[PDB]
Design an enzyme around this catalytic site. Structure first.
Site, mmCIF file in Angstrom:
data_model
loop_
_atom_site.group_PDB
_atom_site.id
_atom_site.type_symbol
_atom_site.label_atom_id
_atom_site.label_comp_id
_atom_site.label_asym_id
_atom_site.label_seq_id
_atom_site.Cartn_x
_atom_site.Cartn_y
_atom_site.Cartn_z
ATOM 1 N N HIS A 110 0.194 1.065 -5.328
ATOM 2 C CA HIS A 110 1.075 -0.016 -5.741
ATOM 3 C C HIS A 110 0.243 -1.206 -6.199
ATOM 4 O O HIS A 110 -0.967 -1.277 -5.968
ATOM 5 C CB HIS A 110 2.018 -0.424 -4.603
ATOM 6 C CG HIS A 110 1.334 -1.139 -3.480
ATOM 7 N ND1 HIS A 110 0.714 -0.477 -2.443
ATOM 8 C CD2 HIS A 110 1.173 -2.461 -3.232
ATOM 9 C CE1 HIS A 110 0.199 -1.359 -1.605
ATOM 10 N NE2 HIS A 110 0.464 -2.571 -2.061
ATOM 11 N N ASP B 241 -0.383 -5.345 -6.230
ATOM 12 C CA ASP B 241 -0.185 -6.596 -5.502
ATOM 13 C C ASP B 241 -0.048 -7.722 -6.518
ATOM 14 O O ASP B 241 -1.043 -8.215 -7.055
ATOM 15 C CB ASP B 241 -1.339 -6.856 -4.542
ATOM 16 C CG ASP B 241 -1.132 -6.203 -3.199
ATOM 17 O OD1 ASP B 241 -0.174 -5.414 -3.062
ATOM 18 O OD2 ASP B 241 -1.924 -6.486 -2.278
ATOM 19 N N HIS C 52 3.011 -11.883 -4.207
ATOM 20 C CA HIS C 52 2.821 -11.321 -2.873
ATOM 21 C C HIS C 52 2.240 -12.352 -1.912
ATOM 22 O O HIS C 52 2.603 -12.382 -0.730
ATOM 23 C CB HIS C 52 1.920 -10.089 -2.945
ATOM 24 C CG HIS C 52 1.853 -9.314 -1.667
ATOM 25 N ND1 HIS C 52 2.924 -9.203 -0.807
ATOM 26 C CD2 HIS C 52 0.844 -8.606 -1.105
ATOM 27 C CE1 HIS C 52 2.578 -8.462 0.230
ATOM 28 N NE2 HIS C 52 1.321 -8.087 0.075
#
Ligand code: ZN
Ligand code: ZN
Ligand code: ZN
Ligand code: ZN
Ligand code: ZN
Lengths: 228, 230
Positions: free
Chosen positions: A52, A54, A58
């Site tokens: 995934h 970031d 975040h």
């Protein structure tokens, strides 16, 4: 242009090791081919699990979400930093400022808008309980990036992405995430759980980050390619 | 890399208010941790697979067909073949890509075969900001363009295209009730792209469509991130 591409995405599921240890995705079969004639699942996804991205949001109040990252930051020149030799002796090995300094002395300067990926030989434990390497107190131990080497990539290069083959940008025993607070709030994004870094050259490859774009998201799984 | 100028994103930004074939919010996000009270932001996504720019896996309309994680990476990088049917769809909102539309593309740009993605540019991607994307009538039946099932039969019989793309909710046109093109293409281990965007910004041929399809284990679909280059 139409050279040889490489996949850099893990195949994640419920048994995939997440940062919290618990599963990060479940599936509910809404329709099956037997009784309905088609298949459809309704997923519940912890967007910061698996391979995934970031996003700056975040670790920021008003940073860039996954949809706000420009396309120019999703096609990155690949710069793979090999520290697996150092990681073999020290499980908590970090990409120190001395690590990427040796990358210049064998491959040349870091291109602009590039992604700096850590090769620690760690993307092979995702099939067992040794990927987190949790301690007796629940303290995970795995390689990562150093905050000072992170800030080194802010002042003296045009790098836009920070990729790691581990679960986090900062190493396991990072209760502060100084690398996260250094690389993400500056509108640069990060990538975690990058797979197949042993199949791409340390320099010359071009990363293709298929980042998700659900509006307002802090992260999300991303299908990542590498044109070797 | 040669002749690489720029890369265009072929993906829409999907949220809870995005058009779906069924007409319900296909995703419900919930921010668990916030930056002020917890130090970082993290959302939990409860979503349907066929939301936004997504890919229909072979298992979407078969018994044991390929899932999204079983699609080969080589079948994700494909030459892009775009057929423009926007002039036709300007009148009838249910214009389908006839096999003659494929033949006219062959005589104009050459053969499709060799791992090609056959994309349909009907000019519907700009309708996402309104009810024209679904184009449902007063009765409830949607009226959007799609692929003629005969064209899918010609692509399997006469070409070697491993994928096809549309710019609306389904590979079948609006009034389709049995989903013929879904049943004639997906069971043959050939996947489709739905809700594509920006097909008006790529050449009709000579482009490479890189499909960032998800690979969650055992899935019939999922939102993807698509791009096109040289
Ligand atoms: Zn994350
Ligand atoms: Zn090495
Ligand atoms: Zn992180
Ligand atoms: Zn679909
Ligand atoms: Zn045209």
């Amino acid at each position: 242009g139409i050279g040889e591409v490489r996949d850099m995405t893990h195949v994640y599921d419920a048994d995939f090791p997440t940062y919290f240890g618990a599963p990060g995705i479940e599936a509910v079969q809404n329709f099956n081919f037997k009784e309905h004639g088609f298949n459809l699942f309704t997923l519940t996804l912890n967007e910061h699990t698996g391979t995934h991205v970031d996003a700056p949001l975040h670790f920021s109040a008003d940073g860039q979400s996954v949809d706000e990252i420009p396309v120019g930051n999703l096609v990155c020149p690949l710069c793979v930093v090999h520290i697996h030799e150092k990681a073999a002796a020290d499980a908590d090995a970090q990409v120190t400022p001395d690590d990427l300094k040796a990358w210049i002395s064998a491959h040349g300067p870091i291109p602009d808008g590039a992604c700096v990926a850590m090769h620690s030989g760690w993307a092979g434990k995702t099939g067992g309980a040794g990927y987190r390497n949790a301690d007796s107190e629940g303290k995970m131990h795995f390689p990562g990036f150093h905050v000072e080497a992170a800030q080194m990539l802010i002042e003296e290069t045009g790098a836009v992405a920070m990729a790691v083959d581990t679960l986090s940008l900062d190493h396991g025993p990072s209760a502060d995430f100084a690398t996260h607070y250094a690389w993400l709030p500056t509108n640069r994004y990060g990538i975690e759980n990058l797979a197949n870094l042993d199949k791409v050259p340390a320099s010359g490859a071009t990363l293709i980050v298929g980042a998700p774009n659900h509006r307002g998201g802090s992260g999300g799984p991303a299908r990542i390619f590498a044109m070797v």
